PDB file of C-alpha atoms in Angstrom:
ATOM      1  CA  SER A   1     -11.401   0.614 -24.425  1.00 52.95           C
ATOM      2  CA  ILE A   2      -9.614   2.702 -27.254  1.00 52.98           C
ATOM      3  CA  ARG A   3     -10.002   6.313 -26.082  1.00 50.79           C
ATOM      4  CA  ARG A   4      -8.220   9.037 -27.424  1.00 49.23           C
ATOM      5  CA  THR A   5      -8.638  12.545 -26.024  1.00 51.63           C
ATOM      6  CA  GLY A   6      -5.143  13.737 -25.159  1.00 53.02           C
ATOM      7  CA  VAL A   7      -1.591  12.607 -23.407  1.00 54.46           C
ATOM      8  CA  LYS A   8       0.612  15.273 -21.523  1.00 54.80           C
ATOM      9  CA  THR A   9       3.945  14.596 -23.269  1.00 53.49           C
ATOM     10  CA  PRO A  10       7.298  16.373 -23.425  1.00 51.28           C
ATOM     11  CA  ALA A  11       8.451  19.093 -25.907  1.00 53.74           C
ATOM     12  CA  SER A  12      11.912  19.363 -25.186  1.00 55.50           C
ATOM     13  CA  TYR A  13      14.965  16.847 -25.130  1.00 56.85           C
ATOM     14  CA  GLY A  14      16.690  16.160 -21.849  1.00 55.09           C
ATOM     15  CA  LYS A  15      20.130  17.027 -21.271  1.00 54.52           C
ATOM     16  CA  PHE A  16      23.347  15.307 -20.497  1.00 59.35           C
ATOM     17  CA  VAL A  17      26.370  17.775 -19.805  1.00 59.47           C
ATOM     18  CA  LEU A  18      29.988  16.943 -19.246  1.00 57.29           C
ATOM     19  CA  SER A  19      30.970  18.523 -15.730  1.00 52.76           C
ATOM     20  CA  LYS A  20      34.290  20.731 -15.731  1.00 53.26           C
ATOM     21  CA  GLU A  21      35.203  18.081 -12.907  1.00 52.24           C
ATOM     22  CA  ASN A  22      33.876  15.377 -15.255  1.00 50.05           C
ATOM     23  CA  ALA A  23      35.881  16.625 -18.716  1.00 49.17           C
ATOM     24  CA  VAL A  24      38.869  15.874 -17.127  1.00 51.01           C
ATOM     25  CA  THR A  25      38.122  12.272 -16.736  1.00 51.11           C
ATOM     26  CA  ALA A  26      37.525  12.248 -20.317  1.00 51.21           C
ATOM     27  CA  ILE A  27      40.701  13.911 -20.863  1.00 50.56           C
ATOM     28  CA  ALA A  28      42.905  11.840 -18.146  1.00 51.24           C
ATOM     29  CA  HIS A  29      41.809   8.285 -18.943  1.00 52.31           C
ATOM     30  CA  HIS A  30      38.957   8.850 -21.166  1.00 50.81           C
ATOM     31  CA  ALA A  31      35.938   7.749 -19.513  1.00 48.42           C
ATOM     32  CA  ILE A  32      32.767   9.544 -18.271  1.00 51.30           C
ATOM     33  CA  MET A  33      31.214   8.772 -14.938  1.00 45.73           C
ATOM     34  CA  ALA A  34      27.671  10.050 -14.733  1.00 45.02           C
ATOM     35  CA  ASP A  35      27.441  12.376 -11.783  1.00 45.30           C
ATOM     36  CA  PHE A  36      31.251  11.789 -11.114  1.00 47.92           C
ATOM     37  CA  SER A  37      31.177  15.027  -9.230  1.00 47.72           C
ATOM     38  CA  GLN A  38      28.376  13.493  -6.716  1.00 48.33           C
ATOM     39  CA  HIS A  39      30.079  10.333  -6.222  1.00 46.98           C
ATOM     40  CA  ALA A  40      33.239  11.972  -5.139  1.00 44.17           C
ATOM     41  CA  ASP A  41      31.127  13.715  -2.048  1.00 43.55           C
ATOM     42  CA  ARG A  42      29.948  10.514  -0.877  1.00 46.45           C
ATOM     43  CA  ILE A  43      33.812   9.479  -0.940  1.00 45.89           C
ATOM     44  CA  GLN A  44      34.573  11.744   1.808  1.00 46.79           C
ATOM     45  CA  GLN A  45      31.542  10.369   3.642  1.00 48.45           C
ATOM     46  CA  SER A  46      30.272   7.041   3.827  1.00 48.75           C
ATOM     47  CA  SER A  47      30.919   5.563   0.658  1.00 50.59           C
ATOM     48  CA  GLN A  48      27.836   3.708  -0.641  1.00 46.49           C
ATOM     49  CA  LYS A  49      25.301   5.905  -0.530  1.00 47.06           C
TER      50      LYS A  49
ATOM     51  CA  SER B   1      36.175   9.054 -26.248  1.00 48.19           C
ATOM     52  CA  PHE B   2      34.426   8.126 -23.389  1.00 49.07           C
ATOM     53  CA  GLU B   3      33.237   4.976 -21.881  1.00 46.41           C
ATOM     54  CA  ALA B   4      30.227   6.822 -20.525  1.00 46.32           C
ATOM     55  CA  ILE B   5      29.289   4.733 -17.295  1.00 46.26           C
ATOM     56  CA  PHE B   6      25.901   5.807 -16.102  1.00 49.00           C
ATOM     57  CA  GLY B   7      24.309   5.418 -12.929  1.00 49.02           C
ATOM     58  CA  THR B   8      24.842   2.013 -10.892  1.00 49.23           C
ATOM     59  CA  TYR B   9      20.903   1.545  -9.926  1.00 47.04           C
ATOM     60  CA  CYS B  10      20.780  -0.792  -6.984  1.00 45.57           C
ATOM     61  CA  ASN B  11      18.172  -3.606  -6.821  1.00 44.73           C
ATOM     62  CA  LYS B  12      16.524  -2.584  -3.531  1.00 48.03           C
ATOM     63  CA  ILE B  13      15.017  -5.891  -2.642  1.00 47.84           C
ATOM     64  CA  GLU B  14      11.416  -6.057  -1.019  1.00 50.54           C
ATOM     65  CA  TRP B  15      11.320  -7.093   2.405  1.00 52.17           C
ATOM     66  CA  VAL B  16       8.664  -9.784   3.712  1.00 52.47           C
ATOM     67  CA  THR B  17       8.133 -11.394   7.210  1.00 59.19           C
ATOM     68  CA  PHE B  18       6.185 -14.467   8.111  1.00 59.16           C
ATOM     69  CA  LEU B  19       3.253 -13.040   9.716  1.00 63.45           C
ATOM     70  CA  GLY B  20       3.036 -10.177   6.865  1.00 63.88           C
ATOM     71  CA  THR B  21       2.655 -12.705   4.555  1.00 60.71           C
ATOM     72  CA  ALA B  22      -1.167 -14.383   4.079  1.00 60.21           C
ATOM     73  CA  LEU B  23       0.143 -17.915   5.218  1.00 60.94           C
ATOM     74  CA  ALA B  24       0.060 -16.556   8.943  1.00 63.28           C
ATOM     75  CA  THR B  25      -3.458 -17.728   9.214  1.00 65.77           C
ATOM     76  CA  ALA B  26      -2.416 -21.168   8.705  1.00 67.86           C
ATOM     77  CA  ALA B  27       0.084 -21.090  11.232  1.00 64.33           C
ATOM     78  CA  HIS B  28      -0.369 -20.442  15.097  1.00 65.93           C
ATOM     79  CA  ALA B  29       3.402 -18.657  15.360  1.00 67.49           C
ATOM     80  CA  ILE B  30       4.561 -19.169  19.249  1.00 66.57           C
ATOM     81  CA  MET B  31       7.785 -18.077  20.732  1.00 64.35           C
ATOM     82  CA  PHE B  32       9.310 -20.446  23.368  1.00 64.04           C
ATOM     83  CA  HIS B  33      12.609 -20.092  24.151  1.00 67.14           C
ATOM     84  CA  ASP B  34      13.564 -23.390  25.670  1.00 65.57           C
ATOM     85  CA  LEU B  35      12.420 -24.731  22.680  1.00 68.60           C
ATOM     86  CA  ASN B  36      15.998 -26.555  21.536  1.00 71.14           C
ATOM     87  CA  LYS B  37      15.408 -28.992  24.820  1.00 70.93           C
ATOM     88  CA  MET B  38      12.164 -30.033  23.757  1.00 68.77           C
ATOM     89  CA  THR B  39      11.532 -33.783  21.825  1.00 69.55           C
ATOM     90  CA  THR B  40       8.204 -33.936  20.815  1.00 67.02           C
ATOM     91  CA  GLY B  41       5.028 -31.569  21.599  1.00 68.96           C
ATOM     92  CA  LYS B  42       2.485 -34.122  21.993  1.00 66.79           C
ATOM     93  CA  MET B  43      -1.171 -32.408  22.212  1.00 66.90           C
ATOM     94  CA  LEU B  44      -3.692 -34.816  24.042  1.00 69.55           C
ATOM     95  CA  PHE B  45      -6.867 -35.118  22.774  1.00 67.66           C
ATOM     96  CA  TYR B  46      -9.891 -36.553  25.074  1.00 64.60           C
ATOM     97  CA  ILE B  47     -12.856 -37.339  22.835  1.00 63.48           C
ATOM     98  CA  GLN B  48     -16.315 -38.110  24.256  1.00 63.64           C
ATOM     99  CA  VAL B  49     -17.961 -40.709  21.974  1.00 63.22           C
ATOM    100  CA  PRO B  50     -21.531 -39.891  20.890  1.00 59.09           C
ATOM    101  CA  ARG B  51     -23.798 -42.597  22.003  1.00 56.75           C
ATOM    102  CA  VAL B  52     -26.635 -44.683  20.525  1.00 54.71           C
ATOM    103  CA  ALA B  53     -28.235 -48.102  21.356  1.00 58.83           C
ATOM    104  CA  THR B  54     -31.816 -49.323  20.516  1.00 57.10           C
ATOM    105  CA  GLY B  55     -33.833 -52.143  19.508  1.00 56.89           C
ATOM    106  CA  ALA B  56     -34.231 -56.056  20.284  1.00 56.01           C
ATOM    107  CA  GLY B  57     -31.628 -58.316  19.408  1.00 57.00           C
ATOM    108  CA  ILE B  58     -29.292 -55.514  18.239  1.00 56.58           C
ATOM    109  CA  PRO B  59     -25.871 -55.494  19.943  1.00 57.56           C
ATOM    110  CA  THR B  60     -25.578 -52.506  21.785  1.00 57.47           C
ATOM    111  CA  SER B  61     -21.868 -51.527  21.262  1.00 57.10           C
ATOM    112  CA  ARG B  62     -20.778 -50.050  24.676  1.00 55.45           C
ATOM    113  CA  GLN B  63     -19.699 -46.844  25.481  1.00 57.25           C
ATOM    114  CA  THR B  64     -16.374 -45.653  24.422  1.00 56.75           C
ATOM    115  CA  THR B  65     -13.451 -43.546  25.629  1.00 56.14           C
ATOM    116  CA  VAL B  66     -10.962 -42.382  23.013  1.00 57.51           C
ATOM    117  CA  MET B  67      -7.787 -40.921  23.901  1.00 54.82           C
ATOM    118  CA  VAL B  68      -5.637 -39.638  20.849  1.00 56.81           C
ATOM    119  CA  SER B  69      -2.393 -37.864  20.442  1.00 58.78           C
ATOM    120  CA  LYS B  70      -0.695 -36.080  17.752  1.00 57.59           C
ATOM    121  CA  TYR B  71       2.933 -35.141  18.055  1.00 59.25           C
ATOM    122  CA  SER B  72       5.139 -32.326  16.768  1.00 60.13           C
ATOM    123  CA  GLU B  73       7.470 -32.631  13.778  1.00 61.15           C
ATOM    124  CA  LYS B  74      10.445 -30.722  14.101  1.00 65.35           C
ATOM    125  CA  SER B  75      12.095 -28.818  10.795  1.00 61.80           C
ATOM    126  CA  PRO B  76      15.014 -26.292  11.580  1.00 59.86           C
ATOM    127  CA  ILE B  77      16.027 -23.471   9.365  1.00 57.73           C
ATOM    128  CA  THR B  78      19.764 -22.279   8.684  1.00 57.29           C
ATOM    129  CA  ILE B  79      21.144 -20.183   6.180  1.00 54.16           C
ATOM    130  CA  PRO B  80      24.781 -18.794   6.248  1.00 54.24           C
ATOM    131  CA  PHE B  81      26.068 -15.496   5.179  1.00 57.24           C
ATOM    132  CA  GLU B  82      29.687 -15.098   4.049  1.00 60.92           C
ATOM    133  CA  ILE B  83      31.760 -11.956   4.871  1.00 61.56           C
ATOM    134  CA  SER B  84      35.027 -11.774   4.053  1.00 61.42           C
ATOM    135  CA  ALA B  85      38.153 -11.710   6.213  1.00 61.42           C
ATOM    136  CA  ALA B  86      39.235  -8.668   4.196  1.00 60.72           C
ATOM    137  CA  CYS B  87      35.748  -6.992   4.457  1.00 58.62           C
ATOM    138  CA  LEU B  88      36.400  -7.551   8.555  1.00 59.29           C
ATOM    139  CA  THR B  89      39.679  -6.027   8.206  1.00 57.25           C
ATOM    140  CA  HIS B  90      38.909  -2.728   7.433  1.00 54.46           C
ATOM    141  CA  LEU B  91      37.199  -1.813  10.695  1.00 54.27           C
ATOM    142  CA  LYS B  92      40.307  -2.627  12.568  1.00 55.88           C
ATOM    143  CA  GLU B  93      43.138  -1.677   9.673  1.00 55.92           C
ATOM    144  CA  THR B  94      41.831   1.761   9.104  1.00 53.67           C
ATOM    145  CA  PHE B  95      44.748   3.449   7.037  1.00 53.39           C
ATOM    146  CA  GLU B  96      45.339   6.920   6.026  1.00 54.37           C
ATOM    147  CA  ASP B  97      41.945   7.864   5.882  1.00 56.51           C
ATOM    148  CA  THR B  98      41.385  10.671   3.219  1.00 58.82           C
ATOM    149  CA  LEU B  99      41.215   9.558  -0.661  1.00 57.77           C
ATOM    150  CA  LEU B 100      41.499   6.034  -0.016  1.00 57.94           C
ATOM    151  CA  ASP B 101      40.198   4.560   3.072  1.00 56.67           C
ATOM    152  CA  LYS B 102      37.012   6.461   4.008  1.00 58.32           C
ATOM    153  CA  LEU B 103      35.635   4.653   0.939  1.00 54.18           C
ATOM    154  CA  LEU B 104      36.517   1.180   1.958  1.00 55.45           C
ATOM    155  CA  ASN B 105      35.853   1.483   5.611  1.00 57.91           C
ATOM    156  CA  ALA B 106      32.324   2.758   5.384  1.00 57.86           C
ATOM    157  CA  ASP B 107      31.537   0.654   2.328  1.00 61.13           C
ATOM    158  CA  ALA B 108      32.825  -2.433   4.603  1.00 63.66           C
ATOM    159  CA  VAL B 109      30.089  -1.108   7.212  1.00 61.61           C
ATOM    160  CA  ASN B 110      27.399  -1.004   4.323  1.00 64.99           C
ATOM    161  CA  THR B 111      28.350  -4.581   3.389  1.00 65.03           C
ATOM    162  CA  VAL B 112      28.344  -6.057   6.636  1.00 63.13           C
ATOM    163  CA  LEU B 113      25.000  -4.125   7.179  1.00 66.42           C
ATOM    164  CA  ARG B 114      23.856  -5.612   3.816  1.00 64.36           C
ATOM    165  CA  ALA B 115      24.292  -9.010   4.540  1.00 67.13           C
ATOM    166  CA  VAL B 116      23.297  -9.063   8.108  1.00 70.34           C
ATOM    167  CA  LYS B 117      19.952  -7.483   6.981  1.00 69.59           C
ATOM    168  CA  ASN B 118      19.656  -9.900   3.966  1.00 71.58           C
ATOM    169  CA  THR B 119      20.098 -12.795   6.440  1.00 69.85           C
ATOM    170  CA  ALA B 120      17.196 -11.380   8.366  1.00 69.99           C
ATOM    171  CA  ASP B 121      15.287 -11.416   5.265  1.00 68.09           C
ATOM    172  CA  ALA B 122      16.412 -15.277   4.644  1.00 65.35           C
ATOM    173  CA  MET B 123      15.225 -16.169   8.024  1.00 66.20           C
ATOM    174  CA  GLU B 124      11.990 -14.997   7.421  1.00 68.05           C
ATOM    175  CA  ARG B 125      11.622 -16.346   3.837  1.00 71.17           C
ATOM    176  CA  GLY B 126      12.807 -19.634   4.889  1.00 71.11           C
ATOM    177  CA  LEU B 127      10.245 -19.581   7.396  1.00 69.24           C
ATOM    178  CA  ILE B 128       7.898 -18.961   4.724  1.00 69.48           C
ATOM    179  CA  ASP B 129       9.507 -21.819   2.990  1.00 69.94           C
ATOM    180  CA  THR B 130       9.385 -24.440   5.587  1.00 73.28           C
ATOM    181  CA  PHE B 131       5.968 -23.834   7.257  1.00 72.40           C
ATOM    182  CA  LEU B 132       4.573 -23.991   3.695  1.00 74.46           C
ATOM    183  CA  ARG B 133       6.654 -27.708   3.134  1.00 74.00           C
ATOM    184  CA  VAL B 134       5.117 -28.761   6.451  1.00 76.91           C
ATOM    185  CA  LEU B 135       1.834 -28.117   4.971  1.00 78.20           C
ATOM    186  CA  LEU B 136       2.765 -29.503   1.941  1.00 75.19           C
ATOM    187  CA  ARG B 137       4.100 -32.533   3.874  1.00 73.18           C
ATOM    188  CA  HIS B 138       1.035 -33.307   5.966  1.00 75.30           C
ATOM    189  CA  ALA B 139      -1.886 -32.558   3.543  1.00 77.11           C
ATOM    190  CA  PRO B 140      -3.211 -35.308   1.457  1.00 75.65           C
ATOM    191  CA  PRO B 141      -3.793 -35.040  -2.466  1.00 72.89           C
ATOM    192  CA  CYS B 142      -7.544 -33.568  -2.543  1.00 68.68           C
ATOM    193  CA  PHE B 143      -8.923 -36.863  -4.106  1.00 68.84           C
ATOM    194  CA  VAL B 144      -7.485 -39.009  -1.005  1.00 68.00           C
ATOM    195  CA  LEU B 145      -9.426 -36.481   1.256  1.00 66.05           C
TER     196      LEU B 145
ATOM    197  CA  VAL C   1      19.587 -11.351  -5.228  1.00 61.27           C
ATOM    198  CA  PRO C   2      17.066 -12.303  -2.138  1.00 60.23           C
ATOM    199  CA  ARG C   3      18.841 -14.509   0.136  1.00 55.59           C
ATOM    200  CA  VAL C   4      16.757 -17.493   1.147  1.00 58.90           C
ATOM    201  CA  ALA C   5      17.951 -20.974   2.513  1.00 63.57           C
ATOM    202  CA  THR C   6      16.206 -23.800   4.542  1.00 64.17           C
ATOM    203  CA  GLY C   7      16.004 -27.073   5.987  1.00 61.81           C
ATOM    204  CA  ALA C   8      18.238 -29.801   7.405  1.00 64.64           C
ATOM    205  CA  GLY C   9      20.722 -31.065   4.729  1.00 62.93           C
ATOM    206  CA  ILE C  10      19.500 -29.091   1.844  1.00 62.80           C
ATOM    207  CA  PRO C  11      22.525 -27.465   0.322  1.00 66.56           C
ATOM    208  CA  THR C  12      22.182 -23.295   0.775  1.00 66.71           C
ATOM    209  CA  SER C  13      23.213 -21.289  -1.850  1.00 65.77           C
ATOM    210  CA  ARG C  14      25.648 -18.488  -0.651  1.00 65.92           C
ATOM    211  CA  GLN C  15      24.836 -14.992  -1.099  1.00 64.31           C
ATOM    212  CA  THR C  16      25.299 -13.684  -4.928  1.00 68.31           C
ATOM    213  CA  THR C  17      26.373 -10.764  -5.708  1.00 66.47           C
ATOM    214  CA  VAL C  18      25.194  -9.388  -9.519  1.00 68.44           C
ATOM    215  CA  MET C  19      26.543  -6.751 -11.310  1.00 67.11           C
ATOM    216  CA  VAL C  20      25.250  -6.354 -14.859  1.00 67.74           C
ATOM    217  CA  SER C  21      26.558  -4.112 -17.585  1.00 69.40           C
ATOM    218  CA  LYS C  22      24.227  -2.791 -20.255  1.00 70.72           C
ATOM    219  CA  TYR C  23      25.591  -0.968 -23.292  1.00 69.12           C
ATOM    220  CA  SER C  24      24.775   1.404 -26.022  1.00 68.09           C
ATOM    221  CA  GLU C  25      24.178   0.324 -29.519  1.00 68.61           C
ATOM    222  CA  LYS C  26      24.349   3.491 -31.935  1.00 67.76           C
ATOM    223  CA  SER C  27      22.994   4.587 -35.318  1.00 67.43           C
ATOM    224  CA  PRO C  28      23.506   7.645 -37.294  1.00 68.29           C
ATOM    225  CA  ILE C  29      21.079   9.482 -39.751  1.00 66.61           C
ATOM    226  CA  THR C  30      21.735  11.447 -42.776  1.00 66.22           C
ATOM    227  CA  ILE C  31      19.935  13.078 -45.533  1.00 67.43           C
ATOM    228  CA  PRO C  32      21.264  14.847 -48.398  1.00 66.71           C
ATOM    229  CA  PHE C  33      19.501  17.729 -49.749  1.00 68.22           C
ATOM    230  CA  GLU C  34      20.806  19.323 -53.260  1.00 69.84           C
ATOM    231  CA  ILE C  35      20.491  23.070 -54.281  1.00 69.86           C
ATOM    232  CA  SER C  36      22.061  23.789 -57.679  1.00 70.63           C
ATOM    233  CA  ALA C  37      24.429  26.555 -58.707  1.00 71.15           C
ATOM    234  CA  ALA C  38      21.900  28.331 -60.571  1.00 70.27           C
ATOM    235  CA  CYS C  39      19.625  28.275 -57.685  1.00 70.11           C
ATOM    236  CA  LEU C  40      22.790  29.193 -55.517  1.00 69.71           C
ATOM    237  CA  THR C  41      23.517  32.193 -57.637  1.00 69.66           C
ATOM    238  CA  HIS C  42      19.937  33.648 -57.717  1.00 70.94           C
ATOM    239  CA  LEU C  43      20.457  34.189 -53.781  1.00 70.39           C
ATOM    240  CA  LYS C  44      23.851  36.312 -54.178  1.00 67.67           C
ATOM    241  CA  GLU C  45      23.217  37.428 -57.856  1.00 66.92           C
ATOM    242  CA  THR C  46      20.808  40.285 -57.633  1.00 67.60           C
ATOM    243  CA  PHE C  47      20.285  41.412 -61.364  1.00 67.02           C
ATOM    244  CA  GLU C  48      19.314  44.638 -62.688  1.00 68.72           C
TER     245      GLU C  48
END
């Protein structure tokens, strides 16, 4: 059952990046919410999507 | 510094119905809407007997008429769901909508739509439960049978 | 949590909202490498 040919595999690291909207939260009250630029758009819509 | 909160992933829970499970072959599932008025569903079975008689001196046991009757056993199911009065208020309370309330109103719509839908799962899963427990409470152990 | 309750008289559990927080345990990595000031010099030295 051990068979070695080759496996598709990632060659680059991922990217997490603080938004211009998100960086102020790190400055104002020292936190980062992931996709805080995207949670806000649900708030001016149906909230919990 | 951050706190770095990442994505609050929801547990989307799998939905089952009574007939979709495999127990449905053990049930003959019938809707009857005036059922609460009933007392004891009582299927009558008329059984003709097989007959054999023979010989000289052998006591011929006479022909037999058998009428057995089995009854129904009730077991109703009941789940509560608990919507807060504050969560019911935001359909009516409905403040300055921007920045504050459009979160809390539309989430209270979701919260009520969450629990009512989750309760429909419970009515099905409880129907999985008690129909199983009826099949437990009428099945003898195998060494008896 | 998957809501279910049952039967007659059986104590029915109210629905539960479970919210768990999972954290980050963090580790640094560091290697030193040494270049001597003769080997440093002969880069920029460029003799006759």
